[PDB]
Design a binder for this molecule. Structure first.
Ligand SMILES: Nc1ncnc2c1ncn2[C@@H]1O[C@H](COP(=O)(O)OP(=O)(O)O)[C@@H](O)[C@H]1O
Lengths: 213, 204, 110, 204, 204
């Protein structure tokens, strides 16, 4: 509403002033935390763009380098798509604190259970070896970029929540407290003007009696 | 007249008296007794009492000073932990909070309707405060010196190691000055001090 | 450990990522891939992506960019974080900064 | 003076009278008439009229208590929506808000300078309230019995399904008590109920 | 009290007076002198000085309106540059945010502890404002004509094609009104105008 339900008195005035000061210090705390998260967001965006560009050029490298190692082992398409026992890249979740928020990122626990060991010892050697080296490094780099994107998303939503809280404390709460402070000042000023009138009446009656008697 | 600090009687009185023991309504609502504010109360005799303490209890004034500093730092941190929520806090802030809670719950808080906490002699008071402040100093030093070394010490691997030293402190207020005595209680407190010293020497 | 990477590309990309070392079969003999060519339709694409998401062990879904070009509706509706989803370029069409769902939230900051 | 209900005459009278119809300027500026507050007003004759309503209308006190509860829950929802937005809300809260808005805009509001709303008999009042609480009950039951299921009939489904029914629920107030009569009004209100019930069978 | 225009005296005097030069302390701490705020100040005598200006300084009122527009636009473009990252800047806005700063630093700022800036006659004032707003106009048109022409001009080319024109603009406020006459300063400003026009045609 336009005011807080309280009764005008010189005790309600200090209570309301305490409330106002507390609210407008909390506002500054939240306004600092939001800009911390915002700086982190603007950094994550830039380095995500750079990692995107570099992994894209790496992907084009791998695209033009696939054919030469393909030319040395026949056609292992059925071999690769039907024979898959156990992938040896794994991923786990870890946290990273930023101003109280817990961004989730990824840890790359490197497992080893290599099934692709036959791989034509005499039909495809260094070619396929460097090929899987390339693509494993690419897998790890894109793991890094995925962790960056996960951070990005959680940070982006927490920024919105904190800005909503700041705007609420700034547009809804503090104006209401200030309104119910101005009202209390007015009402105390109004209580004083009645005691003044009563005392002036008493004095007037005194100075009427003493003179007519 | 409702709780106003500017009642004409209360404002006329505060200009004359030298000691003011204040009333905390929030403490009387949570049933913490005696409900002394300890942040608006004052005494103007703490400089005329100096040569009495410097002759009878020569180690009390530093304990009083440090206790008051701890109780103010806790109030500074409280309205921060309220908004953000104690996630990102230095370990020294954790120790400040968890020693201030001890001081509040076990030293300042007293029960007059019990046969041991009805009248607490001053040797009991000084002993309790001395042991609590000694623990504070030891914990803070431990966490402060091994700050960037290996095996970073924290408040959590202190509450693990010494969990029963943190219980003889939270139960110093149950000794009785008429079933026990002066030398008995003093011996107990000295033994507890040696215990916590040994624990802080072993852990660190 | 608790989560595995997962692919949706083509035969050449899934074999590239098996060479990298990813590609796995469910205990129900379900793969971490669904190869797409001139054969299958987009309803299969979208319910495959749906069962990719709802599967509670997948963390990093790679999808070639030219695959996601018509199922942008399936992945734009994705708004959570941990089911990470990266669109990948290749020689047919390289990386395009326009049709990204993670540069979606960078409006203005460019 | 000033719209302040804390002036001497209002304070003197409110301790004398048994009914209190308190008007609001916020509702008067939007031309929401009559501008009764419905949150500060009261009547101390609500228990003395139980016999009359039981003997004559007999289906009204339930409707009254239900409507009062809806209007009271909406104000708890609104002060939260004002600070954290309309997104943290369950489906039953999204139903409470819309039903309370329907009540406020098409039951409590009554433009008295029109040929249809200059006077509203009590049978028309109970009929409108019946048809407005039946929808609340049906919608809440539908959103609640298919909650854990995957079909999840929510408020937006109910709203795009029945956009032909909500308009009739809002236009229930345009029925002349004189040009239409009692029988035509009662029949139309009994037909809108069947329309509501069939439309709510349609989505399950 | 504390810069609060609600005291009865301040409210009355602002209700009465027609001009209000708002001196600010914030601008004084930045060494911006004369520290007039230019955003809360006003003057309601601008329609009485219309025969005077139109008879003596005919080409002034348009420059006044233009300068006020520019100084307001540089200010309500504040969150656009903070909540966004200075990059989503239409070339019109780059031109603004630069020429408005040119005005703030070389027209609105005056230094009395000099031999040339104690007194600024009005012919010098209208000359210094006409050259600046003429620059603004030409540099803005040069951009918004080649909007889609494959020869996109931005402030980066404008600031390199005219690197001495901008200095001479920022050096207009050193022409002494006593050591240099009035015709001399008029001819200097006209020469600067024609050089601006040339160096803007040698860019298209
Ligand atoms: N129930 C209503 N229906 C239509 N108009 C109304 C209604 N109540 C008030 N008004 C309008 O609002 C104005 C309120 O005036 P009035 O009833 O005299 O209030 P007051 O006596 O408090 O001044 C009237 O002029 C009327 O036009």
């Amino acid at each position: 509403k336009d005011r807080i339900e309280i009764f005008p008195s010189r005790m309600a005035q200090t209570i309301m002033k305490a409330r106002l000061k507390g609210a407008q210090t909390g506002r500054n705390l939240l306004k600092k935390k939001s800009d911390a998260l915002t700086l982190r967001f603007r950094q994550i965006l830039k380095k995500i763009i750079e990692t995107k560009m570099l992994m894209g050029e790496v992907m084009r490298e791998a695209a033009f380098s696939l054919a030469e190692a393909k030319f040395t082992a026949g056609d292992f398409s059925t071999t690769v798509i039907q024979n898959v026992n156990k992938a040896q890249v794994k991923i786990r979740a870890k946290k990273d604190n930023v101003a109280g928020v817990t961004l989730p990122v990824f840890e790359h626990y490197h497992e080893g259970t290599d099934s692709y060991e036959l791989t034509g010892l005499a039909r495809g050697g260094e070619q396929l070896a460097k090929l899987k080296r390339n693509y494993a490094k690419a897998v790890e780099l894109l793991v890094e970029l995925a962790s960056l994107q996960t951070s990005f998303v959680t940070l982006d939503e927490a920024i919105k929540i904190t800005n909503r809280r700041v705007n609420a404390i700034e547009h809804v709460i503090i104006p209401r407290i200030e309104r119910t402070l101005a009202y209390i000042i007015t009402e105390l000023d109004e209580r004083e003007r009645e005691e003044f009138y009563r005392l002036k009446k008493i004095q007037e009656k005194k100075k009427i009696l003493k003179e007519k008697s | 007249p409702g709780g106003d600090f500017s009642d004409p009687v209360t404002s006329a009185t505060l200009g004359i008296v030298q000691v003011f023991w204040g009333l905390d309504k929030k403490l009387a609502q949570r049933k913490h007794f005696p409900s002394v504010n300890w942040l608006i109360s004052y005494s103007k005799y703490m400089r005329a009492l100096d040569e009495y303490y410097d002759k009878h209890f020569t180690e009390f004034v530093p304990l009083r000073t440090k206790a008051k500093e701890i109780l103010q730092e806790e109030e500074d941190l409280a309205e921060i932990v309220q908004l953000v929520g104690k996630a990102s806090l230095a370990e020294t802030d954790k120790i400040t909070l968890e020693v201030a809670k001890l001081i509040k719950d076990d030293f300042l808080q007293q029960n007059g309707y019990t046969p041991y906490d009805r009248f607490c002699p001053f040797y009991k008071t000084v002993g309790m405060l001395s042991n609590m402040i000694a623990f504070y100093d030891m914990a803070r030093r431990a966490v402060e010196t091994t700050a960037q070394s290996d095996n970073k010490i924290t408040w959590s691997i202190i509450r693990e190691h010494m969990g029963d030293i943190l219980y003889k402190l939270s139960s110093m207020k149950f000794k009785d000055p008429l079933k026990d005595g002066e030398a008995k209680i003093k011996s107990d407190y000295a033994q507890l001090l040696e215990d916590m010293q040994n624990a802080f020497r072993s852990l660190e | 450990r608790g989560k595995l990477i997962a692919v949706i590309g083509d035969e050449d990309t899934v074999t590239g990522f098996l060479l990298g070392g990813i590609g796995e079969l469910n205990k129900n003999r379900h793969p971490n891939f669904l190869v797409v060519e001139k054969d299958t339709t987009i309803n299969e694409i979208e319910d495959t992506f749906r069962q990719f998401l709802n599967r509670d062990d997948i963390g990093i879904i790679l999808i070639n960019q030219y695959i996601a070009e018509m199922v942008r509706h399936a992945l734009d509706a994705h708004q959570q974080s941990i089911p990470a989803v990266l669109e990948i370029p290749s020689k047919e069409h390289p990386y395009d900064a326009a049709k990204d769902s993670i540069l979606r939230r960078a409006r203005g900051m460019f």
